[PDB]
């Protein structure tokens, strides 16, 4: 066998066809961004939540 899969049936691991090494693949960082603000009638400063 060459490559693996997870429960969600997506590529999880691969095999390098030059050194017979198995490499785990993980997606690089991502997420949601929310903005915490008071009213614009009060201030213009904000905070950010990742």
């Amino acid at each position: 066998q060459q490559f693996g899969r997870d429960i969600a049936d997506t590529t999880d691991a691969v095999r390098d066809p030059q050194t017979l090494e198995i490499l785990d693949i993980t997606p690089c960082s991502f997420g949601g961004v929310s903005v915490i603000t008071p009213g614009t009638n009060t201030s213009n400063q904000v905070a950010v939540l990742y």
Partner: peptide, 30 residues
Amino acid sequence: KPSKRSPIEDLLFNKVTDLICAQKFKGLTV
């Protein structure tokens, strides 16, 4: 106990119970 729970609350919390990461990688978060 470090949770400050009662002898029955602990039993209830014990009696109720990679998939999370796999679903997160599809865009579904909790």
